[PDB]
Structures are given as structure tokens and as C-alpha cells.
Swiss-Prot record, chains A, B:
Residues 5-189 form the Glutamine amidotransferase type-1 domain. This is GMP synthase [glutamine-hydrolyzing]. It catalyses: XMP + L-glutamine + ATP + H2O = GMP + L-glutamate + AMP + diphosphate + 2 H(+). NCBIfam families: guaA_Cterm, guaA_Nterm, PRK00074.1. It comes from Coxiella burnetii (strain RSA 493 / Nine Mile phase I). Pfam families: GATase (PF00117), GMP_synt_C (PF00958), NAD_synthase (PF02540). The lineage of its organism: Bacteria, Pseudomonadati, Pseudomonadota, Gammaproteobacteria, Legionellales. Keywords: ATP-binding, Glutamine amidotransferase, GMP biosynthesis, Ligase, Nucleotide-binding, Purine biosynthesis. Catalyzes the synthesis of GMP from XMP. HAMAP family: GMP_synthase (MF_00344).
Length: 464, 464
């Protein structure tokens, strides 16, 4: 496995990760490297094909290497500049195909009165190409853009002025599948079952007969590491679960049911609850909260291990956190979709797999001021109530994330709770919200009044 | 004028006031006293009839006076208990009338398969009466209550197990009108025109040729007081408008336009802004904030006057203010309904009359922490934007009250703004709220994020 692979160069752009994800969905391995990376890397990666992406809001020698190249938006611009030819805002556009090529064979959204194939696409209007380089030809155009797609054919270089990754070009996934499977000639073996097997073999070859600790604390990625490791080395896995005090009401219990009661597993419970409240005893700065919690986390995991004489630590590091810039990281090449797909296949329960993300520092965010315990206990209840409804009204999975935050401000007196749910804040029904607010204030004394965040992904962050 | 009058005894109950208001709408004066008030008062008030309200969530000798007496809910119970007879949850209930009497003559919601009159009423299921007193006969029943209404006729005592004041007994106002107009034999002379004339005369009688200071700061109550005085004594009126710094963005301008520019009127403007900020420099406690404002407000008014040599101060005190327990107070027997009706007839512009209530201490509340000036200037911007929309979307007059509040906390970093809108928090559309919030965070820098209060009148207080 791994032997068929696509290199994606990142020129910025939200959608770089997502080119990669679409490629993994097609069934082929790929890595996402920044464009400032050097030849050697790229040479030693020796890809079947390269995809240039991006531009937010020069790559060099990759046209010498034998493989095919696909430039997306800005990727098309520099592909133009760096070969011959001249060069110089996002929306839907109706693209018209001239030469259905290799990259567009089939692939039609409409046919048009004149009998020409048309694609609905999400254009990047600013990444314009004025004149074609030598060897290229117009393979697609739009009313406002004479050359919205390029193609060499002899060198197998291709350009698009739109984003095929995004759902707003419906047939985009087929276009990418045509590049990867047909033009780059990759056979799909990046499967899930094949990932599970490759990963078990890796864990076995690296760890041998000696023990591994995995922190159950941490949601889907941890659960997947623990089970993945468990399957690889059985009794050698020793699970540790630290109650930092910063976890959701029933997390400790829910986790123990899965790993201890079901499926055997040695699980060590560490208290750490008093430890974490000290160390955060002052500390209002939310950036210093994140440091202290997390430092104190790795410390606890080092103490356990420098105690059970364990040399290896298993972490749930995934690929997105890798690309943001003695351990065993089984998921470090995987995106979140994939971890979820592995999770189901490994035998974890659905409700754990598709649970809302939970931050690393946990509830140490979600309290605005100093974190205290007096405060976590009352936050735990409002949050519990909030997600209990949602579950009872099947609204839970219609939102991407949902939680309560605690403001230590007080009103007519008692503290204020803020509710956060997004999808782009979620348009939940009045009467339902009322029932959630009504309950939080009534059941939890020492509160009075709850509020709902109405601020979107662009202007404000999801977490406070 | 005042020559016909109803006494209302208050035994607790949201709807005590409201009986009063209904009686006032019918055109008859009335006062609201607590049930524990003494004989003498009552004698001195010399009513033409009495209404007993009450029961939240034993008056004595009132039955000795020749005047009629109506008991609502608990009022019916105590009336029963204090005469002969025995006694012992609120909802809709279909009342069947036996004997249309004087109190139900006409007044039918539905007839009935047996040809008998039926009323939709809003029962108090708990204030039951087991056995009629001497002189009384059952005058109405429901499936669950054999005697939901009582009547003496000889003594003109009447009881109801339901609330006629409330909108959920649609015919209730007619029943009250029948008591006040027909049984108590009163004449509806409490008209707004007569109140204006009696009030102008009362001012003239009291103040004669000497001058009066009226504060223009204070919305509808102030405005009406000032116009009323202006009509009474012309150039003798001297208006004072103090800008405390706790007033809304354009309030100074709007009042000056109506009083200084339109309709002559001597208006003195006082700066007071530095003064109020000093007074409230520390002081987080919102009970103290309320106290320091108001104190400082009265002080400012005494200094003017003890300077212009004026001996009379006019105020917008209204009857609800009097109820909760050298000056001229013309509005002190009126409810808000009536003050608004007056202002309109007196020539004040509609948009001032039906303006949302603004609190006495103003923007001193609505900043949670210590009021700073740096914080009011942020809040003024937030508030302004909020109501500008609403005006634009015609949602302003579909809510009873709307305002912003400033929380000095900060999130991912700038301060947080809560928005409050009620009528029972306002079910405004997702599209519209999003517009407001986007605008508050983009236009006011140093904000970031904004929330919305989802808490009702029963659990949380309207204002913070």
C-alpha cells in the first residue's frame, strides 16, 4: 500500500485540505505539502500526479518530473506564468466545454440549445489567464472568461479556473476522479480495511512485545487509537483515563462502559481533579489557560509510564493537526472522515463516533473568567440539560456543535449562561429554545437568565 | 369630576392592577388599596362599589356599607367565608349561566344544545366555595364547579370563580362594565378630555402666578407633564433637560426638537455628564448604581430652582409608582395607558408617545459592571443599531421593549453585547437577528460577538 500517491501543493486557500480529502475518498493516498517545500521531498515522494491548489482569500521544477499536473485557480495562474503565456471574487458560473478532453469525458450538468456540454461551477474570477502558454489550448470557457480551462495533453498539464473540490461544482468530484484514476493512472487501494491492516502491522513492527499507554480522555480520536492499538497488541495496551475535572458530565462513565465493561481493557483512572484546579487557580488569560491545562496533561501521562515502566505513548494526533505549523501516532495520516470510518469498522458505537467535537483543554474554555470548580459544577448542569434536549428532539445531529458557556457576570441575582450552536449559528425553533432556557434557570439555582450566541464563523470564532 | 368611584382591594395577584385599568377604560375613576388597609380610608374614600381581587400565584366591615361588592376568585371565597358558608391551578373553562341576573344580562359566548347561555372564562380552580351563604343563590356553574358564581341581589354582593379582567375571558370587560355602570349606578365621566381640564385647573389653583421647573429627561411621563403645565401656565413653565450621559444617542436632540423648536418653551440644558461619571466611578452594585443616579438627579434639579428662584418642581410620577410602597404631580392618578392617551390629545407626536419605556437611571443599568463612559459610548452604538433596524423592519412596535446591554468580559478579543427584546422574549426572524448582530460586531470595533436573551418575564426580570 501507499505505493500509489498524489502530491497536493498548498498555495493557501481554505480548500487545500479538501482537495486531499476528495482524493482520499476516491481511494488514493495523498499528502498536502506547502509550496515553499523543496525539490528532494517531492522527488523522494515521487508522486503519480501533482495538484496545485489555492491562493487565499511559484513551485518550480515539478514540470520536469514525468508525472501529470492539475492547477486549480491560482494553481492554474502560476502554471501559466511558469511556462509561457500571460496572466493577471468568487461565484457560480456556467462553464461551457470545448474539447471534452480526458479531464471532462462524460461530465455534464446541462446540454444547452446549441448542443454544447455545460458545467455548473464555482469560479475564481480573479485568477485570470490572458494568453495560453506554448503547448496549451482552451479546453473550457465562460461568458466572462475566454479561457477557464487549459490542457497540454502531451505533457499532461491541466488548469481549471474553478474549484472542483467544493460542492458548488456538483460534478467536481468526477473531474478530480478523472485526473487521479485515469490520467495519473492510480489504482485505488486506500480503503479503510486496508488502512486498519496497515496500521496494525505498523503498531506491531514498532512496539514489538512492550507495553503502550493510551489516554482515553479525548473523544473519537483517542477511542480509535485505543481500539486500534488494542487490536494490534492486546494485553500490552494499558488505557489511562484522567478526570481533569474539565470533562462533560457523564464522559468518565460513558468511556468506562465502552473500554472497561465492553471489550475487556485495562483502564487506570487517575483523579487529577484537585491538581488541575490548582495550577489554574489564578489565570484569566485564555491563552495561558490553554497552556497550563495541557502542560499538566502531558505531565500526568509522563508520571504514569514513569511508574508502570511503559516506554511507548499512543496519541490520537491526526493529519490536520500535523499539517498545522516515545510516541506512536496511528492516525497521523488520516483526516477526520477517515478516523470516523475506521471507528465504526473497528466496532465503536455510532453515538461516540458522530459526537460533537470537544476541545483539548475541555471546559477550561467555556468559562470566561478564572476556572474554579464552583463554576464547572454549574456549567456541567446547564450543558447537560442543553444536549439532553436536542437528543430528545432529534435536533442534535442537525447541528455541527452545541454547548453552554459560563459568564461570571451575574444579573437579576445570579450568573449568566450562554448557549452556542452552529452548523452559521443554528436557527433552532423558538419554543424549543424557550424549553431549554426555562429549564436551565429553574433547575439550576444560582443562575438566572441564559443567552444565545448569534455570531457567525467569519466574524467570531466557534469557541469563546 | 372624581364624583363616581370604585375601590379595589388588592389580595395579591398579577391582575390586581388591570381590574383598575379595565374600570378606568369603562370611564369610571378607581383606586387600588391593599386589603389590610383600615376602615377610615374607605369611609373617607366613600366608594360607589367595591371589587375584591386577589390570590397571588379577610377585609371585614365592607359589607356594612350600602354599596355593592364584587368578589373575583379569592375575593369570592373570602366574601363567602366572611358571610355564612363553607369553602376549600388556573385554566380555560366553559361557564354555564343560571340566572342572567344584573351581572350577566346579555353577555353570551355560545348558546348550547339545551338553549342555555355559555361563557368562555379563565377559572381559578382552587378558590372553590362548598356551600352558599344566607341570601345567596348560585348564578353560574361549570362541569367541575357547582357554584362558579354567586349573587345576593338584596345586598348586591356578587362572586365569580374566574377572572373577568383577563383577555382569556373574552366577555369579561362587559361583565365588569355591568357591575360598574348598572349595579353601582356610576356614570362614565373619566374621559381623557375631562382629565386634561381638571388637571390644568388643578395646576393653576396650586401654582398661581409663580414658576415651575419640569424635567424633560424621562420620556413619555415627563413630556406629558411638561405640555400639561405649559398649557396651564404658559411662560411660567421653565423646562430643564439634564444630559446625564446615561441617555440614548439622540434623546437630547429629539426632546429639544419637540419642546424648544416646536412649541416655544423655555428649555435650559444642563451638562451634568462629567458629574454623573464621577458619582458612579466605582460602584458595581446595581442597587447602589440606581441610588447614586436619582440622588444626583434630584440634586441637579434642586440647584437649578435654588438659582432661578423657582419654588415648584413638576414630575411625571404615575399611579403605579404611587402604588409600590415642593412638588406637583399631575400624572399621579393615571396608568400608562391613560398617560399615552393624554399626550396624544395634548398634541405630542405619536412616535414619542408609543416609544418603549426607558428606565429612570437609564444606561446605568445595561452596563453590567462599573459604568465608565468608555463603556456607555460602546453601548450607545450597539443600542442605536439595534433599534434602527426594527424601525426599518417594522418590528419595533411588535415588541413591548427592546435594548442592548454591555458585558465587560471579552471573547475571541473584544467585549460582548447582549440584546433584549420582549412582549415572553421576542421570536424575531433568524435573517433579521443575523443582520443586526453582523452589524454590531463589524461597525463597532472592540466588540466581537453578540448574544440574545432567551429568558421570560416569570423567571428573569425584563431589565438586567
Amino acid at each position: 500500500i501507499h505505493q500509489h500517491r498524489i502530491l497536493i501543493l498548498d498555495f493557501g486557500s481554505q480548500y487545500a485540505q479538501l482537495i486531499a480529502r476528495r482524493v482520499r475518498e476516491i481511494g488514493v493516498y495523498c499528502e498536502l505539502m506547502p509550496c515553499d517545500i523543496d525539490e528532494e521531498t517531492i522527488r523522494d515522494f515521487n508522486p503519480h500526479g501533482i495538484i496545485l491548489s489555492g491562493g487565499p482569500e511559484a513551485p518550480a521544477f515539478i514540470f520536469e518530473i514525468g508525472c501529470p499536473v492539475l492547477g486549480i485557480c491560482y494553481g492554474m495562474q502560476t502554471m501559466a506564468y511558469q511556462l509561457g503565456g500571460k496572466v493577471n471574487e468568487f461565484g457560480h458560473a456556467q462553464l461551457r466545454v470545448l474539447n471534452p478532453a480526458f479531464l471532462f469525458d462524460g461530465i455534464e450538468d446541462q446540454v444547452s440549445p446549441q448542443g454544447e456540454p455545460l458545467l455548473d461551477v464555482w469560479m475564481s474570477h480573479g485568477d485570470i489567464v490572458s494568453e495560453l502558454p506554448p503547448g496549451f489550448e482552451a479546453t473550457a470557457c465562460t461568458d466572462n472568461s475566454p479561457l477557464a480551462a487549459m490542457a497540454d495533453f502531451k505533457r499532461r498539464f491541466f488548469g481549471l479556473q474553478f474549484h472542483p473540490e467544493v460542492t458548488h461544482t456538483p460534478q467536481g468530484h468526477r473531474i478530480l476522479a478523472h485526473f487521479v484514476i485515469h490520467i495519473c493512472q492510480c489504482i485505488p487501494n486506500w480503503t479503510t480495511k486496508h488502512i486498519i491492516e496497515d496500521s496494525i502491522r505498523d503498531i506491531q513492527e514498532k512496539v514489538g512485545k512492550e507495553q503502550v499507554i493510551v489516554g482515553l480522555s479525548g473523544g473519537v480520536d483517542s477511542a480509535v487509537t485505543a481500539t486500534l492499538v488494542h487490536k494490534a497488541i492486546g494485553d500490552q495496551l494499558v488505557c489511562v483515563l484522567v478526570d481533569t475535572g474539565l470533562l462533560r458530565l457523564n464522559e468518565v462513565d460513558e468511556v468506562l462502559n465502552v473500554f472497561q465493561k465492553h471489550l475487556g481493557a485495562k483502564v487506570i483512572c487517575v483523579d487529577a481533579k484537585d491538581r488541575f484546579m490548582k495550577a489554574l487557580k489564578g489565570i484569566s488569560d485564555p491563552e495561558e489557560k490553554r497552556k497550563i491545562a495541557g502542560e499538566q496533561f502531558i505531565r500526568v501521562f509522563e508520571e504514569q509510564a514513569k511508574k508502570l515502566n511503559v516506554k511507548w505513548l499512543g496519541q490520537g494526533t491526526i493529519y490536520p493537526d500535523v499539517i498545522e505549523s516515545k510516541l506512536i501516532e496511528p492516525l497521523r495520516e488520516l483526516f477526520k472522515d477517515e478516523v470516523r470510518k475506521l471507528g465504526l469498522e473497528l466496532g465503536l458505537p455510532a453515538d461516540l463516533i458522530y459526537r460533537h467535537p470537544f476541545p483539548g483543554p475541555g471546559l477550561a474554555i467555556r468559562i470566561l473568567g478564572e476556572v474554579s470548580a464552583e463554576y464547572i459544577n454549574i456549567l456541567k448542569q446547564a450543558d447537560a440539560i442543553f444536549i439532553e434536549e436536542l437528543k430528545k428532539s432529534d435536533y442534535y445531529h442537525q447541528v455541527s456543535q452545541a454547548f453552554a458557556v459560563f459568564m461570571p457576570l451575574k444579573s437579576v441575582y445570579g450568573y449568566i449562561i450562554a448557549l452556542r450552536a452552529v452548523k452559521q449559528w443554528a436557527d433552532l425553533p423558538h419554543e424549543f429554545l424557550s424549553k431549554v432556557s426555562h429549564r436551565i434557570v429553574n433547575e439550576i439555582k444560582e443562575v438566572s437568565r441564559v443567552v444565545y450566541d448569534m455570531t457567525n464563523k467569519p466574524p467570531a470564532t466557534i469557541e469563546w
